[PDB]
Amino acid sequence: VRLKSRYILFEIIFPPTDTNVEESVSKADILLSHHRASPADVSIKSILQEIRRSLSLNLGDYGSAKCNSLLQLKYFSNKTSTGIIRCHREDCDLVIMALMLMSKIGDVDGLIVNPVKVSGTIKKIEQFAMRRNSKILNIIKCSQSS
Template structure:
């Protein structure tokens, strides 16, 4: 019996930093970028927007490839985190559609501008979930540090992102990817 092979994309919605001149930039950058999504975003709306974007980029072929197997598994507006499932053969199309989206999809099309950033591609939802929890924890620590930091005690922080890139690049450490191949 052959399983249907899938990919789970863990996606963060990132908002651009505030205009430092216009408002009082009291909030740390990190918190602004990962602020909660306040729009009325539901899984259904997101799926429809994604399908429209895929159709505009890849035409009927792309829309057909992602027609049946695209679904939003997890959507947290408070942390602006989404987990999307699609078939393994076509996840790159979905990913590039996400790259091309530039605002939060809503019913009336008045969402704020944002960036959809894929932070993890994995073969099981469990790994995606673990990664989401790990990142949320790390972000919490960083936010605490940022808010307690005074300019004098500014220590050079470790860059937290480069490992994430590699993470998203290779999913080979996922055990399900091994048994997905046999």
């Protein structure tokens, strides 16, 4: 006997809103300009407290009651700004739509959230994340060598 809970990978991307500053047009350069850094006051509990407030103000209470049954952040590190949220397979739609409507953190505004990978296991999501980061290193190395 086991439980069939799905995990969702998300990444915090900062859009470079600079109206007076010029821009360079390339692939890995705009990957550098979007994958810059996470700010100082970002942790597991801060992202959980923000997403529960977004779940309250956006989806309500009983929808928040269905979502908050197994709403946990299993793995997150601020150095790469990628996180894995555990959820049910039925309310995965609700969790992804809550991840979409994330507007701003209470400390830092001007950011979007990208839900990338959903699977019922975390080990294949880690294997996909290593391969996706390997492809990012490939693009960076191709633009760095030439």
